[PDB]
Amino acid sequence: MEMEKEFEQIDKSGSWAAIYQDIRHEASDFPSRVAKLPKNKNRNRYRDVSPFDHSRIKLHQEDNDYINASLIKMEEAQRSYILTQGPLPNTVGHFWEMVWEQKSRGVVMLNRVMEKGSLKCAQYWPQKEEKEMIFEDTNLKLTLISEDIKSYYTVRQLELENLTTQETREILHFHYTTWPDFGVPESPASFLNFLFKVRESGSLSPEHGPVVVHCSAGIGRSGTFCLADTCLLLMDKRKDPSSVDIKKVLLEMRKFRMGLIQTADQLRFSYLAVIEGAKFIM
Numbered sequence: 001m002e003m004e005k006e007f008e009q010i011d012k013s014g015s016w017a018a019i020y021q022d023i024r025h026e027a028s029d030f031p032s033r034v035a036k037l038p039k040n041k042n043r044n045r046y047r048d049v050s051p052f053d054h055s056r057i058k059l060h061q062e063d064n065d066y067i068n069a070s071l072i073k074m075e076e077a078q079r080s081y082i083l084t085q086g087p088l089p090n091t092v093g094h095f096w097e098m099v100w101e102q103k104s105r106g107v108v109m110l111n112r113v114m115e116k117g118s119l120k121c122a123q124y125w126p127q128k129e130e131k132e133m134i135f136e137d138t139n140l141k142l143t144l145i146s147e148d149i150k151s152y153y154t155v156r157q158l159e160l161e162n163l164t165t166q167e168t169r170e171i172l173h174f175h176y177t178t179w180p181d182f183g184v185p186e187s188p189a190s191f192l193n194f195l196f197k198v199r200e201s202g203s204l205s206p207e208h209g210p211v212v213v214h215c216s217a218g219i220g221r222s223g224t225f226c227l228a229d230t231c232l233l234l235m236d237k238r239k240d241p242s243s244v245d246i247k248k249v250l251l252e253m254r255k256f257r258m259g260l261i262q263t264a265d266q267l268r269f270s271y272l273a274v275i276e277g278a279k280f281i282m
């Protein structure tokens, strides 16, 4: 079926939970043996969210190459994404090592450091120009260059220096700051505006390594971001845009990381975002 009318048909019939449970039943199950090794327990935020072995990002280290991060490679859309958990106190150096080694231009953050009164990720970037951060375990230096605070999101320019080679690179930090502590946004308008700002920066384009996107577990809000982006790109590329099937795209993405889209409300919000987004593109 088309999307906008499939949408109203699920609303009128109130069957979002049944649709979402079908997706959960059909989703791929691949091994995640490296994630579950005992030496990696303090590298995982949640015991039930792990990268598959076949698609995990490897650190360029011979001691321990493990990080909780996955490469989502979308062949028809010609887009790639790295989805990862919010960094832990003992993985902030690994996080920036990954950004460096994978040649990423942009980092997309969809959570606040504290939500619901608890810490959802480490404070992993510097908050003042004159107070830079050094990650001694991976030999990197990170400096805040500029910050632009808007009503729904903040954009930061960062300098990452590899202290071993003295090479430097400019990284863009795109921080969506207004996702509610509970539920999903009422309108997709600010989330779509944010997606378009990331696109306009070049961070999603083939001349760079894959964008790094995270929330707390790296599957819910993060899944919503890449699902909406890929569906909108396919609607622009195909002769028949009504042929794009958001449930089929989501199941394709779940071949590369488990659990993408965590609730039936996030599934409905993803439909809404693609529907409204397709009208603005034209």
Ligand SMILES: O[C@H]1CN[C@H]2Cc3c([nH]c4ccccc34)[C@@H]1C2
Pocket (backbone or CB within 6 Å): 007, 186, 187, 188, 272, 275, 276
């Ligand atoms: O109620 C329907 C209206 N038309 C479509 C778009 C749309 C819907 N709900 C929304 C809420 C906020 C923004 C846009 C929408 C449903 C489907």
